[PDB]
Write an enzyme that holds these catalytic residues in place. Structure first.
Site, PDB file in Angstrom:
ATOM      1  N   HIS A  63       0.813  -1.210   0.000  1.00 51.30           N
ATOM      2  CA  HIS A  63       0.000   0.000   0.000  1.00 51.30           C
ATOM      3  C   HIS A  63       0.849   1.265   0.000  1.00 51.30           C
ATOM      4  CE1 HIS A  63      -3.231  -2.768   1.341  1.00 51.30           C
ATOM      5  NE2 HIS A  63      -4.044  -1.862   0.832  1.00 51.30           N
ATOM      6  N   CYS A 121      -1.885   2.934  -6.097  1.00 53.62           N
ATOM      7  CA  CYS A 121      -1.848   3.598  -4.797  1.00 53.62           C
ATOM      8  C   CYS A 121      -0.968   4.842  -4.829  1.00 53.62           C
ATOM      9  CB  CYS A 121      -1.353   2.631  -3.718  1.00 53.62           C
ATOM     10  SG  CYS A 121       0.008   1.561  -4.241  1.00 53.62           S
TER      11      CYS A 121
END
Length: 175
Positions: A63, A121
């Site tokens: 992430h 992301c």
């Protein structure tokens, strides 16, 4: 593949440091298992201070998280922007621990926008920072929320278009 390439720290930094945005960090150090976000914030409070909008790009493995610390107005607030699957509660409370140091409820904004933007992301981080800088005094929690909602309303062709255009601008900073 350039179209599904996960942005590295330097690649994301070069784009975000291009026009307070802190250098991209990992949440928890692998060896010593310290909370780097907590350590970074603590180091900040002891030196000069925290800006009115403190932006952290935090990597939790796969992430890239947009972590915003902002005062509004007497109370400082924390904002977590996740564009992928929901963070597990373990990762969440490492962020909560760091939030407390900043002086803080931690507002987790989690919406998967990467079904058509693979490893995007870092892309949404780059794009939303530009949004927040064009937003000014607007509530950042509603800036990012309505952006993510509106992004889901787009067609696959439009979402994939955002994927290739954004990457072509980001890659330029690293070249």
């Amino acid at each position: 593949p350039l179209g599904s390439r996960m942005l590295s720290s330097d690649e994301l930094a070069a784009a975000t440091q291009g026009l307070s945005v802190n250098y991209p960090i990992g949440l928890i150090h692998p060896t010593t298992k310290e909370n780097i976000l907590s350590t970074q914030l603590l180091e900040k409070i002891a030196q000069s201070g925290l800006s009115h909008n403190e932006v952290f790009l935090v990597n939790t493995g796969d992430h890239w998280l947009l972590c915003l610390f902002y005062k509004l107005a007497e109370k400082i607030k924390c904002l977590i922007f996740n564009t992928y699957y929901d963070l597990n509660e373990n990762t969440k409370q490492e962020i909560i621990e760091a939030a407390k140091i900043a002086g803080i409820e931690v507002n987790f904004i989690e919406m998967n926008l990467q079904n058509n933007v693979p490893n995007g992301c870092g892309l949404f981080c780059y794009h939303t920072i530009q949004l927040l800088s064009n937003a000014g005094q607007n509530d950042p929690a509603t800036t990012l929320r309505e952006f993510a909602e509106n992004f889901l309303t787009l067609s696959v062709e439009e979402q994939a278009l955002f994927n290739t255009q954004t990457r072509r601008q980001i890659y330029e900073y690293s070249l």
